[PDB]
Design a binder for this molecule. Structure first.
Ligand SMILES: Nc1ncnc2c1ncn2[C@@H]1O[C@H](COP(=O)(O)OP(=O)(O)OP(=O)(O)O)[C@@H](O)[C@H]1O
Ligand SMILES: [Mg+2]
Lengths: 62, 48, 51, 390, 47, 102
């Protein structure tokens, strides 16, 4: 037999895009970097690009 | 190259020793030692 | 770094002129470029820029 | 105390330059070797009671560790489970080889005394044992004449001339450090000793005495030195001792104290309470200023050999060695590199020679040139402000 | 017929690289039809 | 049909045979005998069978011993330290010399 075998990403989050206000630019950039490569990768093939895996956010303390 | 390969071949032919293994010389052994292997195995030293 | 364990020590200088052009071509082949994109001009506009 | 083991080395045809004399000599080696192989194959192919006794012997013999022999035929043994037993003793053992701590053999079912296994050396030490003969005799050691003389006095002469010392009661040195910058011959002068020494040679690496299990390092060291003493009038080459040799400090972690424990056991072996046989320790290091006086002491380490960056004459002789086997061009004077007082190691000379050959090969040629040597030096060398003096 | 137990023979002398040279030097220095009848007897093993 | 039936039968017959332990050879002492330590218990000597030559049982090699009679019966694929045995490259990366420039 091969038993199909965790630590993080099982306490399903709650906050939502309706909850976050403003920062449309930040949402756009984080989304294009994080989600679309996972939902519409055809858009990226068409341009012929490597999706930007890895982004960094600046900002004051909060 | 074939001198090296013949070195390998001779080391394959020989290079293993019979070792000691504590085998005794004769005149001090015992035949019909089956009395041992018929009475043995005492698993003590774990008794306190 | 003794020359007994690491014999040769190659350096990778930041792509110079027209080496930046070569990299632009290499990473823009799978793309959709218009008639009138000057990868050379892009190279000059990018001074001292790593690959 | 079994006796010296050393290594098996075939003879060395004197010529190196490609020569029909070399071909003839090497074919001589070939023919004697074929002859040996013949004799073997022929004689061993062309050409009862103990058989049944060993059959009675348990086929899958296990190994225990004897403890507190009792009586004449009833000895206590142990097992690799932490358990132990009052096992019987057969008539096949030589007896008198059974001592506490002896790794004994036992029967699978009966669990009796059915062997002594007076051959158990840890794999971590038997792999470190040396049986090859690395072809680095004292001919490629350019210069370094004083260092070779000192090491010869330390290692060879109390083997090939044990009369000078006994004539005047003196006792030969027991240990020698080779210390110095990165690339000087500290390991060549060990390889050549391995070559010409009819005594067992024992690799050692300081990073090999640090063991995961607590307390295992100061047992591997004991195994190493016990193997050295038992198995031969031998030599033990602790390369890169700066891997464990750092000065003992108070420390606040477990690993550092364990490393210090390994050091202490090494020191106890070198000069402990009891004594040391004919084991000569050869240690190597890049920095001697970062060692414990305990092991730098002149009772465990009786000689210290600097390996200073070779001087001009030694550097010349080193180019001679490392170009001798090359097709040189008559337009090459091996003095442009000599005259410059740029820090040049023996390894640096070797790399210069190799790189020069490479530049020639790129130039589509198989014989070096002066421009090729110049480029080789320039592209090989790796690495006080002006006017502050003079 | 009884299998004639052959002597335990060895391997050849192998090439010592002047074996052939020595052999050549020594050499140079030296320089029923089956019938068509049976006529079986009276008890004949006639298959 | 006979071929496939017979293959299944032989598979069952051979698969109903008890497995074998996997240990490491400390050192091949004497022909046909090997001192091999089998995890996690201690180390035993063996009775090497006839189907593999002794010379191939080098020290520090993984050998399988019959679960019954502890007889060596193969030279397993010598390997240690999964931490690094999971390090040799199986998939060749996709970059090519044509992807470099300058
Ligand atoms: N006198 C010499 N003649 C020729 N080669 C030498 C000499 N001294 C050093 N070498 C070079 O040394 C190289 C081996 O390294 P070497 O023994 O010098 O290292 P080390 O720094 O002294 O010691 P370790 O190997 O422990 O780091 C060999 O390639 C050999 O070319
Ligand atoms: Mg060295």
């Amino acid at each position: 037999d091969v038993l199909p075998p965790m630590l993080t990403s099982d306490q399903k989050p709650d906050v939502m895009y309706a909850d976050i206000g403003g920062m449309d630019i930040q949402k756009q950039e984080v989304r294009e970097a994080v989600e679309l490569p996972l939902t519409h990768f055809e858009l990226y093939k068409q341009i012929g690009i490597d999706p930007p895996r890895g982004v960094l956010m600046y900002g004051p303390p909060g | 190259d074939d001198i090296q390969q013949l070195l390998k071949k001779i080391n394959e032919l020989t290079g293993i020793k019979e070792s000691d293994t504590g085998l005794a010389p004769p005149a001090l052994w015992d035949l019909a030692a089956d009395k041992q292997t018929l009475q043995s195995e005492q698993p003590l030293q774990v008794a306190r | 770094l003794r020359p007994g364990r690491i014999d040769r020590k190659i350096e990778f200088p930041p792509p110079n002129e027209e080496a930046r052009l070569d990299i632009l071509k290499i990473h823009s082949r799978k793309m959709n470029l218009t008639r009138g994109i000057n990868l050379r001009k892009i190279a000059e506009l990018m001074p001292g820029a790593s690959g | 105390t079994k006796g010296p083991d050393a290594a098996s080395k075939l003879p060395l045809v004197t010529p190196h330059t490609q020569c029909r004399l070399k071909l003839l000599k090497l074919e001589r080696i070939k023919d004697y070797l074929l002859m040996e192989e013949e004799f073997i194959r022929n004689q061993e192919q062309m050409k009862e009671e103990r058989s049944k006794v060993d059959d009675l012997r348990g086929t899958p013999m296990s190994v225990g560790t004897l403890e507190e022999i009792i009586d004449d035929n009833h000895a206590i043994v142990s097992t690799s489970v932490g358990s132990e037993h009052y096992v019987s003793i057969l008539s096949f053992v030589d007896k008198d080889l059974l001592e506490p701590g002896c790794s004994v053999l036992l029967n699978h079912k009966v669990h009796a005394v059915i062997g002594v296994l007076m051959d158990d050396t840890d794999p971590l030490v038997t792999v470190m044992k040396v049986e090859k003969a690395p072809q680095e005799t004292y001919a490629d050691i350019g210069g370094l004449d004083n260092q070779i003389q000192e090491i010869k006095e330390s290692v060879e002469l109390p083997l090939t001339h044990p009369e000078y010392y006994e004539e005047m009661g003196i006792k030969p040195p027991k240990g020698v450090i080779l210390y110095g910058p990165p690339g000087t011959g500290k390991t060549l002068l060990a390889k050549a000793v391995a070559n010409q020494t009819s005594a067992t040679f024992l690799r050692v690496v300081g990073s090999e005495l640090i063991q995961k299990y607590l307390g295992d390092g100061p047992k591997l060291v004991r195994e190493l030195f016990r193997v050295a003493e038992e198995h031969a009038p031998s030599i033990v080459f602790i390369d890169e001792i700066d891997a464990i040799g750092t000065k003992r400090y108070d420390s606040n972690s477990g690993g550092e104290r364990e490393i210090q424990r390994t050091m202490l056991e090494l020191l106890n072996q070198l000069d402990g309470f009891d004594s040391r046989g004919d084991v000569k320790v050869i240690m190597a290091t890049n920095r001697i200023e970062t060692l414990d006086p305990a092991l730098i002491r002149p009772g465990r380490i009786d000689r210290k050999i600097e390996f200073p960056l070779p001087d001009e004459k030694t550097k010349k002789r080193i180019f001679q060695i490392h170009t001798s086997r090359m097709t040189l061009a008559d337009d090459v004077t091996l003095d442009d590199l000599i005259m410059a007082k740029d820090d040049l190691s023996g390894a640096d000379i070797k790399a210069i020679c190799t790189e020069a050959g490479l530049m020639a090969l790129r130039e589509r040629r198989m014989k070096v040139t002066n421009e090729d040597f110049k480029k080789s030096k320039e592209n090989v060398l790796y690495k006080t402000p002006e006017g502050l003096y003079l | 017929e009884v299998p004639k137990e052959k002597e335990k023979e060895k391997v050849s002398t192998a090439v010592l690289s002047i074996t052939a040279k020595a052999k050549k030097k020594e050499k140079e220095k030296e320089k029923e039809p089956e019938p068509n009848f049976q006529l079986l007897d009276n008890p004949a093993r006639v298959m | 049909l006979n071929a496939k039936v017979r293959l299944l039968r032989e598979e069952l017959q051979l698969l109903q045979e008890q497995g074998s332990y996997v240990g490491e050879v400390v050192r091949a002492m004497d022909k046909k005998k090997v001192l091999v330590k089998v995890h996690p218990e201690g180390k035993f000597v063996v009775d090497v069978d006839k189907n593999i030559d002794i010379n191939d049982v080098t020290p520090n090699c993984r050998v399988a011993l019959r679960n019954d009679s502890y007889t060596l019966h193969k030279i397993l694929p010598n390997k240690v330290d999964p931490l690094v045995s999971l390090m040799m490259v199986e998939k060749v990366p996709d970059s090519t010399y044509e992807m470099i420039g300058g």
